[PDB]
């Protein structure tokens, strides 16, 4: 349950400023580690370039978990992407390449969730030669313990999908004003993907993310669902709680609004500079 | 580096457990190193880690730490001197109704927490009910434990020790609820009252035969809609022994608890919560305080 | 030194979820896929899915870090 989870306790931060602090701290730690061991070389990546590469490789992680030959459940994909987000929240892209950590996060998500996939299958899902698949498996196994250590052994990730379904059930049940809430299902799937692209998974509860997706779909489709907040959730009386929830939802909607996807030329340049940083260790 | 080994507690088929002491809190813990192809960290260890990282109850074991090195890990739990199996099997120490009630209360409180968190301890037996010198029972190992809420998930029917297996798991139920834990809890209570394994089966068919000849074969008004399980086979209609004959020295309230925990219908079977609300636990012999529970000395 | 049962108050930061028995006669189970008879033969009742979905929907709403 989320309200008791380690995701609530440790991996749910108060602001994007704390996230940027953590990532800049990780980048600075790697930079100082490189300098103090044999001082401002432009080979290093900046925190924002690291964030661009993280967005790019999270997109590639979605692409891999979407073309996975066995149909990967969406909880597994959400868990893998959450692992990617956290690992690179506290670790630098130049230390651990995001493609290996991408595959390792997918691997550990397949194992932590009970999507039982054998290692030969998992590496067969890679568009590389069987030699390349074997080497990729070797790297994944090398990095799996590192990934689990960097997650502080908090392996249970709570995804917004089950709260999404539960909100849909409660909405069909106690909200007769709304008819056929599955148009909301399609549009909220779209918004939920959009919001998974951003750093909102580290900033809001999965329940709040799901409710924001649903109410955003309603607002796009012209439905008003303030009676589902004030009534049917009894926020009519604790006005401060209602305004707090509305602020959370507005903040996260704006957070999806300001998300700028990684470029095509910038990602090319960042990939080349990162591979030069990794080759010259 | 931070924990020093003290004793060679033993092994399981996937772990080596050593008593240890941390240099930071001089508290005695139990470290569990996992052994080692081309799969990575063992899934039983990851299941321990992932499930015990998000549980914090008095009556569930808690991993105080987890770490590791190249291709292998070590968990760090509370050190638990004994389990309930050594308490059951030790002929020297008696188990009064208050002691039995204490063990049952601790077991069901831990399991009620675990079930309110939609986790299912799919392997419950006296071996896996540890308890410290303070006499606090804790559910031991979660290397086969799952989340039982989601419909889209196809479970496995083979996962619980045969002797403490519910009839539906033997019939091959790929989907089940808290009834598996509650049947294992009823079997634990029966073994706790008899001091010998209730229904010790040599096979799944033998386990079912013994369940049915001890309790009576379900008549489809007691377990309606039974015939649909994947591995259901019809059985000779056994009468079953009356519960006040199996446990000749258990009170009427305890008999009602036994009957509830041993209902064939996995939905009419009582849950941990409503088991805790039964008159047995509220009646005159209070559970023993954990300080007065018997410990098997050496 | 008898025992009195206490309902294990664990504070969910969210709206109240109705109880599992008082869940089909509030109308929720009409919008959850019915459990197959085989599934019902085990402990599965299609209200476990509904109750879990409702508990995760309301787990943390009235909570921010
Ligand atoms: N928390 C603990 N404190 C103290 N001793 C423990 C603890 N957990 C396990 N042990 C001991 O370590 C032994 C091996 O660990 P287990 O928990 O049995 O692993 P296992 O894989 O379940 O063993 P098997 O498969 O049943 S043989 C147990 O038999 C206990 O004696
Ligand atoms: Mg063992």
- Percent in helix of chain B: 25-40%
> What is the number of helical segments of chain C per DSSP (H or I, 4+ residues)?
2
Number of strands of chain B: 10
The ordered string of helix (H) and strand (E) elements of chain C is: HH
Helical content band of chain C: 10-25%
Could you name the CATH topology of the largest domain in chain B? Transferase(Phosphotransferase), domain 1
Quaternary assembly: heterotrimer
What is the C-level CATH assignment of the largest domain in chain B?
Answer: Mainly Alpha
Ligand inventory reads: phosphothiophosphoric acid-adenylate ester, magnesium ion
What shape does the CA trace of chain B take? globular
Q: What's this model, at a glance?
A:
Chain B is α+β, with helices and mostly antiparallel strands and 298 residues long.
How would you portray this structure in words?
The complex is a heterotrimer of chains A (281), B (298) and C (65). Chain A is mainly alpha-helical and 281 residues long. Chain A has helices at residues 6-9, 16-36, 47-67, 74-90, 98-112, 119-124, 130-150, 161-174, 183-197, 206-220, 226-230, 239-257, 265-279. In chain A, α3 runs antiparallel to α4, α8 (161-174) packs across α10 (206-220) and α10 (206-220) packs across α12. Chain A is globular. By secondary structure, chain B is an alpha+beta fold. A 5-stranded antiparallel sheet of chain B has the order 1-2-3-5-4, with helices on one face. A 3-stranded antiparallel sheet of chain B has the order 6-8-9. A two-stranded antiparallel sheet of chain B has the order 7-10. The radius of gyration of chain B is 20 Å and the shape is globular. Chain C has 65 residues and is mainly alpha-helical. Chain C has a domain at 21-57. Chain C has helices spanning 37-41, 47-57. Chain C starts with 36 loop residues before the first helix and ends in an 8-residue tail after the last helix. Chain B binds chain C through residues 101, 105, 109, 112-113, 116, 118, 148-151, 168, 171, 173-180, 223, 225-230, 266-267, 269, 273, 276-277, 281-284, 286-287, 289, and chain C through 1-5, 7-8, 10, 33, 35-46, 48-49, 51-53, 55. The structure holds phosphothiophosphoric acid-adenylate ester and magnesium ion. Chain A: It is found in: Nucleus. Chain A: Belongs to the cyclin family. Cyclin C subfamily. Chain A: Keywords: Cell cycle, Cyclin, Nucleus, Phosphoprotein, Transcription, Transcription regulation. Chain A: This is Cyclin-H.
């Amino acid at each position: 349950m989320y309200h008791n989870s380690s995701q609530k306790r440790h991996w749910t931060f108060s602001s994007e400023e704390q996230l940027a602090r953590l990532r800049a701290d990780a980048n600075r730690k790697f930079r100082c580690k490189a300098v103090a061991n044999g001082p401002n070389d432009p080979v290093f990546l900046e925190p924002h370039e690291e964030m661009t590469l993280c967005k790019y490789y999270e997109k590639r992680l979605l692409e891999f978990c979407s073309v996975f030959k066995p149909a990967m459940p969406r909880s597994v994909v959400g868990t893998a992407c959450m692992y990617f987000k956290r690992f690179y929240l506290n670790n630098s892209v130049m230390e651990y390449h995001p493609r290996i950590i991408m595959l390792t996060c997918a691997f550990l998500a397949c194992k932590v969730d009970e999507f039982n996939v054998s290692s030969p299958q998992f590496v067969g899902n890679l568009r590389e030669s069987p030699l390349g698949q074997e080497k990729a498996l070797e790297q994944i196994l090398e990095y799996e313990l590192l990934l689990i250590q960097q997650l502080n052994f908090h392996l249970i990730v709570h995804n917004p999908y089950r709260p999404f379904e539960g909100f849909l059930i409660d909405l069909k049940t106690r909200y007769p004003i709304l008819e056929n809430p599955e148009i909301l299902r399609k549009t909220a799937d779209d918004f939920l993907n959009r919001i998974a692209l951003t750093d909102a998974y580290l900033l809001y509860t999965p329940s709040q993310i799901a409710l924001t997706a649903i109410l955003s779909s309603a607002s796009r489709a012209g439905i008003t669902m303030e009676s589902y907040l004030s009534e049917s959730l009894m926020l009519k009386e604790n006005r401060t709680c209602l305004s707090q929830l509305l602020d959370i939802m507005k903040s996260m909607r704006n957070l999806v609004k300001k998300y700028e996807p990684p470029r095509s030329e910038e990602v090319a340049v960042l990939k080349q500079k990162l591979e030069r940083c990794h080759s010259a260790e | 580096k931070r924990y020093e080994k003290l004793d060679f507690l033993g092994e399981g088929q996937f772990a080596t457990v050593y008593k240890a002491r941390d240099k930071n809190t001089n508290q005695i813990v139990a470290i569990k190193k996992i052994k080692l192809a081309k799969d990575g960290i063992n899934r039983t260890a990851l299941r321990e880690i992932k499930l015990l990282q998000e549980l914090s109850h008095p009556n569930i074991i808690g991993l105080l730490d987890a770490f590791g090195h190249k291709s292998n890990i070590s968990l760090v739990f509370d050190f638990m001197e004994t389990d309930l199996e050594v308490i059951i099997k030790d002929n020297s120490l008696v188990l009064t109704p208050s002691h039995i009630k204490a063990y049952m209360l601790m077991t069901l409180q831990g399991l009620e927490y675990l079930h309110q968190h939609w986790i299912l301890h799919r392997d419950l037996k006296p071996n896996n009910l540890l308890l410290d010198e303070n006499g606090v029972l804790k559910l031991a190992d979660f290397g086969l434990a799952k989340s039982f809420g989601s419909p889209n998930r196809a479970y496995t029917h083979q996962v619980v020790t045969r002797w403490y297996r519910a009839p539906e798991l033997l019939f091959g139920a790929r989907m089940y609820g808290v009834g598996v834990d509650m049947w294992a809890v009823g079997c634990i209570l029966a073994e706790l009252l008899l001091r010998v394994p209730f229904l010790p089966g040599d096979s799944d068919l033998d386990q079912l035969t013994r369940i049915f000849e001890t309790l009576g074969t379900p008549t489809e008004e007691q377990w309606p809609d039974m015939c649909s399980l994947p591995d259901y086979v019809t059985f000779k209609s056994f009468p079953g022994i009356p519960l006040h004959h199996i446990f000749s020295a258990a009170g009427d309230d305890l008999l009602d608890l036994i009957q509830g925990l041993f209902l064939f219908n996995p939905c009419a079977r009582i849950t941990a919560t409503q088991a805790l609300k039964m008159k047995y636990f509220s009646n005159r012999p209070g559970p023993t305080p954990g300080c007065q529970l018997p410990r098997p000395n050496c | 030194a008898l025992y009195e049962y206490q309902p294990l108050q664990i504070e969910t930061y969210g709206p109240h979820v109705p109880e599992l028995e008082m869940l089909g006669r509030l109308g929720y189970l009409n919008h959850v896929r019915a459990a197959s008879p085989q599934d019902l033969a085990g402990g599965y009742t299609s209200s476990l899915a509904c109750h879990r979905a409702l508990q995760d929907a309301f787990s943390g709403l009235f909570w921010q870090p």
